[PDB]
Amino acid sequence: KNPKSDKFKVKRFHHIEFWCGDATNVARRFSWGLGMRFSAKSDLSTGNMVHASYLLTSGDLRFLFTAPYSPSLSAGEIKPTTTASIPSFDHGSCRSFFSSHGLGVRAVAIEVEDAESAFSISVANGAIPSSPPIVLNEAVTIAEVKLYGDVVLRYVSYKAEFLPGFERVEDASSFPLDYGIRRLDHAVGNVPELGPALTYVAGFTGFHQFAEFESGLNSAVLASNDEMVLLPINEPVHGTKRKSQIQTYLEHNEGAGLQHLALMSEDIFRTLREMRKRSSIGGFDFMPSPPPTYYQNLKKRVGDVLSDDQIKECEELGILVDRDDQGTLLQIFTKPLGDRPTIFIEIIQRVGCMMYQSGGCGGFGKGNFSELFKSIEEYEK
Amino acid sequence: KNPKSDKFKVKRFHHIEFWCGDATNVARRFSWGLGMRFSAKSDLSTGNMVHASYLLTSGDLRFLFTAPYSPSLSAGEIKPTTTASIPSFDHGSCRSFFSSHGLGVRAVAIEVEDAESAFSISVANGAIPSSPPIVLNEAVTIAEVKLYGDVVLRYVSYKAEFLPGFERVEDASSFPLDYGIRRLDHAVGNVPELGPALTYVAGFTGFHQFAEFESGLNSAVLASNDEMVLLPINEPVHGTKRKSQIQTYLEHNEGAGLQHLALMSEDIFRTLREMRKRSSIGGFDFMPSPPPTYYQNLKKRVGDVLSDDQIKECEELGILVDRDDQGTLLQIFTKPLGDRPTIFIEIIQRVGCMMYQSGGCGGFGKGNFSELFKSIEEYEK
């Protein structure tokens, strides 16, 4: 059931912003590892004396990497005279965030019809304000409210090119990498207590619970009206035999924060071939693959959706498969993106639910918890 | 003239340590950009609850990348019970360094016969102590004194495998990249005042001035007995028409620090081909190349050392050439390694001074200041 209860008009995920200590090195690493092109910049070369921000794109997916300069470069500025292109940026907040959490997502940004309205309605319905609406060059409005931990939900609305004050990157510096990633499918937070987190976020957005179908977690998914903005949230389950990886996250992250970003691929086999080629030469590593019993068990579960060749291709690449009542999900997870065992990436492709494809087709892979356990014990044999 | 006045026995450059906010992303970027292999690690997976440290190697060149974990992981530890593999590490120092300077070199490490003696003799001769000698697993001794800014000169001595507590990296995670870089040739600092800096460092090391032969700088080079440890230092020249890039460094770095690392290649043409292939796909960018007048002028200056083909190959790759009275230098400079216009890398190869090759053969390229200016005005035409 979908009550379509959004309290303001939400369009799509717009961008994800990482707060970094050095934006250049993270952006270059991510660009090569994920096949994303350098598309825009805001930094000293564009007159920004406050922060260095670099935008990577692949299809509609936008990853922004931002780090603070020395405050001394902008010590004469005030907010009315700022050279920052993102007016919510604050040196102290950014240094505090990165010293507390390490490299991670500061902003989950969604595009909306009217960011000022979304902010006002959100705060009127319990959202904790983080940065009030500001109109950039009379063209774009940005506003921010707290989501969980030190992660903000950022509203962006356009009157009619990323943000004013960003410059498009020269084609010499803009190599057209592309491994098939096309958009952000969902963004997942880890919190100590799931109940209060859902009440808060659903309270100020009107997002509804997306219907699903001991591994250390309880989770629920909040969704916009057309279920294209998807925000799952996890809490740890305590007292298990294997310590909850949600609790490990909370400890190493110094509390709640973004756990993983799921990136839709138009061809997950190509994406994984290209990413795995680069794992040991600057790119991303993947979690250890399931045993062959897992793929031997896939025929009985998805043999009507994937051929034997397509299943064997999943086994080569370590891809996981799950299914709901409406569609099928192919997914795989990276190892953590940085030093701490906190944030990681999921690559996904969804098959089914054609009307365009409806959001969340095939679910989020919760069935893969038990089937992985089954396969390991099976392969033990 | 070389008085061989070292106050203690110095061997070779041992490693360079970068202090990072996220060591993983910087190390992976550097590995791909420079062709260095992942060779050792000290991190959560090796029992280090304090800092993540990753070692890259190419030939004898060793780059170490270190970042702090949350202090909470090690809040129960004291120095007697520390799990840090580098006992000089301090969370607060590292966060302060990176927030002040951005990504940059914390330690210039040289191998010595006896790090405890080197420390004692250094401090007895004016060195400001930074970390006293500590013996690691009865096998290696490390000590640190201040060099300039927040950069330390690190002494390492071995009784008889990087450092105790580091583990060699699995070959799966250890791709054998190699673009030809083989060792650190010299490490260069920028200071506000050259005179006091040389007096200080030469005072506690016994290093001697290496003999040389308005562009915004004055420089001098300190050298060990066999002139294999080479430490140039620059100060700005004020009041010029073009603002000194040394002064820009000092402003963006928040004071003195390491300006560039010169990395010797056994085949600079191969190194530059391989590095330039990767500039726009995660590696390093190079400074804009000199005009063809520069290479048209190279025949008259080094036509007896390089063939026309070898000169044309320099023009393809943007390589600079200089010469002293004993040898010839091929060199090229990267753009800054990170967000700030501070640290960069030089790639060099030296030809001549065969006896082995003596240190500093061909100098440091100070002749390329005027010859570049000449070439630009010539090419203006």
Ligand SMILES: Cc1c(C(=O)C2=C(O)CCCC2=O)ccc(S(C)(=O)=O)c1-n1c(=O)cc(C(F)(F)F)n(C)c1=O
């Ligand atoms: C994150 C995840 C999802 C997933 O996407 C998801 C949602 O999007 C919303 C619903 C809740 C949820 O879990 C699906 C399956 C698995 S799992 C175990 O079957 O592979 C995992 N999953 C883990 O739960 C833990 C780890 C660990 F390493 F951190 F422990 N990893 C690497 C995982 O991939």
Ligand SMILES: Cc1c(C(=O)C2=C(O)CCCC2=O)ccc(S(C)(=O)=O)c1-n1c(=O)cc(C(F)(F)F)n(C)c1=O
């Ligand atoms: C650093 C350097 C050296 C060099 O290695 C060196 C020593 O090792 C010790 C002696 C003093 C010294 O200078 C040689 C030639 C040149 S230069 C202008 O001729 O190309 C440059 N040099 C600059 O001085 C300034 C910049 C700038 F971008 F920051 F301005 N760059 C990119 C440079 O490369």
Ligand SMILES: [Co+2]
């Ligand atoms: Co997911």
Ligand SMILES: [Co+2]
């Ligand atoms: Co040099």
